[PDB]
Design a protein around this ligand. Sequence first.
Ligand SMILES: O=S(=O)(NCCNC/C=C/c1ccc(Br)cc1)c1cccc2cnccc12
Lengths: 20, 347
Amino acid sequence: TTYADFIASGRTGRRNAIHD
Amino acid sequence: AAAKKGSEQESVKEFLAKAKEDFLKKWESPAQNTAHLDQFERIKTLGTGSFGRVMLVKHKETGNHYAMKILDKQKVVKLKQIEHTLNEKRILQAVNFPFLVKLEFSFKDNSNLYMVMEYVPGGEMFSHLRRIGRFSEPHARFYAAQIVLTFEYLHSLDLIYRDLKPENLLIDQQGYIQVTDFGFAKRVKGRTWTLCGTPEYLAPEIILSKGYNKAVDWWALGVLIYEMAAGYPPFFADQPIQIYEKIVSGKVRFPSHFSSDLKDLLRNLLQVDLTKRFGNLKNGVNDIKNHKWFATTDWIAIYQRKVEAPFIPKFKGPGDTSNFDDYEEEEIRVSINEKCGKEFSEF
Ligand SMILES: O=S(=O)(NCCNC/C=C/c1ccc(Br)cc1)c1cccc2cnccc12
């Protein structure tokens, strides 16, 4: 499932803004 | 409906003209140096970023709690965020809206810049969203309506916000949204070019170096609504480059549980073509406010905070932080030498 793919991904934690 | 210029539209217009008068006065003469670090007792870190942290503090003279953002001037300089930091403070001190966190004080010392804002004890939407999984459509609609009105306000002041995401939305004791993080907010008439924001939320025109305007905030709204209702963003991957390929491809898939009204709204917000993107057309924000998905929304009642929130955060007295994650604490050091004085003279 897409949800399961999301949960297994490395971007379910707080996402940083990109500066440079 | 979306095109119709009824008496309701005039009331909004009237309200916004007065709001612009108030804003411009503070925009042109910013509050400066309105407190000192020693006036505050530092309690606990509530969040961290590249060039500082936000800590829960207690104002000694009143006993009020606040969220104090501490920015290391040298780190700001190294990351080339000087102008963005000046933008952030000048804009936040000048704005006033029920869903915008208030800046109560600001000041600086040899080492750091400080922005003391109201403490919002319910924690980040991000925390609640990840834990619960996803919000119901009526729950997501309630939050989305607040962002719609907030963007209508900000945009009327020629402001672009540029960092919408659940991590920057706090839930107050009434269960209403407070928007924080004005680090990328900018007052611009017409076009701007800085590649900034958060990968999942970037409009295609930003990633394609096109030059862009307030329509990027409407696209970000599409991403936010999708993420709140789905539990995951419409474009995700393990690496940012992969996210960008998805964003520019022009393809989006919706969970099978999305209502057809919700899908239709999101097709119009997550619209690569600017001549077609909702929020960016002749009808402006009204194309959004009058969309079917928002039929049940009473915009004036939302603004007035009269609508019952779908949840109230657990509140265990003043100064409680159990709605926030724990972060490593670091002692605030103030150099004996002034750093970067010229660069931040207006702060
Ligand atoms: O703790 S926060 O920072 N959470 C909102 C954004 N998510 C955390 C990011 C913190 C952060 C700190 C410094 C930098 Br530079 C960048 C991000 C936060 C920021 C501003 C006002 C707040 C009021 N009440 C509670 C929290 C408040």
